[PDB]
Amino acid sequence: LYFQGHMIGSLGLVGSGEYLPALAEFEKSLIEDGIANGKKPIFLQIPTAAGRESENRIEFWKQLGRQQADRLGYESKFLPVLKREDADNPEFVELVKDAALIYFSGGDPHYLADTLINTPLWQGIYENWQSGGSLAGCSAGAMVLSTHVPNFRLSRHQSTEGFGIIENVRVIPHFNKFFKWIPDSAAKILLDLPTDSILIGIDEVTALVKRSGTDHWQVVGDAKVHILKGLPEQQLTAGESISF
C-alpha cells in the first residue's frame, strides 16, 4: 500500500482510433496499469484538442468515450476543457490528480498545446502520471507530448511548444494517410524540425506504449510504427519492442 505511487505511469502514443473497439484492449490495459499503481479506476477523457469544434462534435466525443468506458467496465470522466480559462477549474484540477488513465483525444494539436501548456490542469495531469497513472494521446494528443509541434502553415522554425514529456521523441500520427492530405512543403516541415532527436511515425489504429516499470516501448494494434530519424530506419509491428 504505502509502497504505491513511486513509479511513472504507462505512456501511450496512438496514431488514430481512440475509444474504438480495435484499441479497446489497449485502453483497458492502460487503465489496469494505473489501477495496479493505486489510482482510482477512472477513464478520464480530455477533448481539448477539439475545443474549437461544434457543441455537437464535443458531445459526440463525450458519447464515444463513454461507450468505450462502458464496454471496458470503468467509469469515465469527461473533462469539458475547451478553452484555457477552463484549465483553471479547481474541480477539474482535483480530478486529474487521481486517475488510472488520462487520455488526450484528437483534434488540433496547436490548440491543445496552447490551451493547456503551463496550466494548473496540466500540472495535475503531470503529477498524476509521475505518480503512476497512465497517460495517452491519440493523433493530436500524441503530437503535443513532444517539446515542439510542427506548424505547416509557417515554417520549421515556428513550431508550437508542446508539453515536452517525451523529451527526445516526436510522433507523426495517421502515418499511412497524413501525407495524402498535405502538400510537399508541409510534408517537409512535418518530417524535419530543428528541435528533433528521434522521429517516429505511427500508423492508424496502431500505438506505441512504454509500460509502467519498464523502459522500452512496445508496438500495439493493427499496423506499423516507423522509425524515421535519430535511429536506423525500421518498421515495427505488434509485439515488437524498441528502446529510445
Where in the chain are the domains?
1-244
Cell of 34: 494505473
Cell of 7: 513509479
Q: How far apart are CA 113 and CA 149, in angstroms?
A: 8
Q: How far apart are CA 17 and CA 174, in angstroms?
A: 9
Q: How far apart are CA 62 and CA 242, in angstroms?
A: 34
Phi first, then psi, for residue 88 (nearest 5°) are: -105, -10
Which has the closest alpha carbon to 203: 230, 224, 228, 182? 224
Q: How far apart are CA 96 and CA 123, in angstroms?
A: 9
Amino acid letter, 129: W
64's enclosing H/E stretch is: helix 55-72
**157 contacts: CB under 8 Å, gap ≥ 6:** 194
User: Measured between alpha carbons, how far is residue 1 from residues 6, 38, 80, 99, 235 in Å?
Assistant: 11, 8, 32, 17, 40
Q: Assign 156 to helix, strand or coil.
A: coil
Technique used to solve these coordinates: X-ray
Q: What is the largest CA-CA distance in the chain?
A: 54
Phi first, then psi, for residue 21 (nearest 5°) are: -55, -35
Half-sphere exposure of 161 (CA within 13 A, CB side): 5
Kindly state the DSSP code that residue 10 receives in the 8-state scheme: P
Amino acid letter, 162: G
